[PDB]
Swiss-Prot record:
The lineage of its organism: Eukaryota, Metazoa, Chordata, Craniata, Vertebrata. It is found in: Endosome; Early endosome; Early endosome membrane; Cell membrane. Belongs to the sorting nexin family. Involved in several stages of intracellular trafficking. Interacts with membranes containing phosphatidylinositol 3-phosphate (PtdIns(3P)) or phosphatidylinositol 3,4-bisphosphate (PtdIns(3,4)P2). Acts in part as component of the retromer membrane-deforming SNX-BAR subcomplex. The SNX-BAR retromer mediates retrograde transport of cargo proteins from endosomes to the trans-Golgi network (TGN) and is involved in endosome-to-plasma membrane transport for cargo protein recycling. It comes from the Eukaryota. Forms heterodimers with BAR domain-containing sorting nexins SNX1 and SNX2; does not homodimerize. The heterodimers are proposed to self-assemble into helical arrays on the membrane to stabilize and expand local membrane curvature underlying endosomal tubule formation. This is Sorting nexin-5. A 1,2-diacyl-sn-glycero-3-phospho-(1D-myo-inositol-4,5-bisphosphate) binds at residues 13-19, 72-78, 86-89. Residues 1-143 form the PX domain. The PX domain mediates interaction with membranes enriched in phosphatidylinositol 3,4-bisphosphate and/or phosphatidylinositol 4,5-bisphosphate. The BAR domain is able to sense membrane curvature upon dimerization. Membrane remodeling seems to implicate insertion of an amphipathic helix (AH) in the membrane.
């Protein structure tokens, strides 16, 4: 519990995408840093869940259900219809309806952020699953901690003796 604390402090709704800031505070020796944040989308959560489900060792374990898919269709439909009718409304009527629209966006955000956040928090509190290496990668993988492995061989007789590849 206290050893690995995860939250989603903010999220972004775009026309074609929803992004979550995943923020971690940890004392665990395994992590590069004690505090860090990454950006993740729903499909990354689904990947993590699928990976844990397919892990043989975790048979007989209760895996936290995957988050629900983010759906901003409702608010975005109302946003369009409100735009169509802007000419037919007073300043005060329009602003009221913009308030209700923003209240609906807020309710959707609240529900989907909680769904994604709880999933990670349940993993963080599981004595076994909190150690999973894919879970670790989900939380901290970033351009800043990319590592590269360099290899070289002697030549004879085709220069072309070196290899580079990213490693986790």
């Amino acid at each position: 519990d206290p050893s690995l604390q995860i939250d989603i402090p903010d999220a972004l709704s775009e026309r074609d995408k929803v992004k979550f800031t995943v923020h971690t505070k940890t004392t665990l020796p395994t992590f590069q840093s004690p505090e860090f944040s990454v950006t993740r989308q729903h499909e990354d959560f689904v990947w993590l869940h699928d990976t844990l489900i397919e892990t043989t060792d975790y048979a007989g374990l209760i895996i936290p259900p995957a988050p629900t898919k983010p759906d901003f269709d409702g608010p975005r439909e109302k946003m369009q219809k409100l735009g169509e009718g802007e000419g037919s409304m007073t300043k005060e009527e329009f602003a009221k309806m913009k308030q209700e629209l923003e209240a609906e966006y807020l309710a959707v955000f609240k529900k989907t952020v909680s769904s994604h956040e709880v999933f990670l928090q349940r993993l963080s509190s599981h004595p076994v699953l909190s150690k999973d290496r894919n879970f670790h990668v989900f939380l901290e993988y970033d351009q800043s901690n990319v590592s590269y492995k360099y290899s070289k061989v002697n030549k004879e007789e085709e220069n072309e003796t070196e290899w580079l590849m990213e490693e986790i």
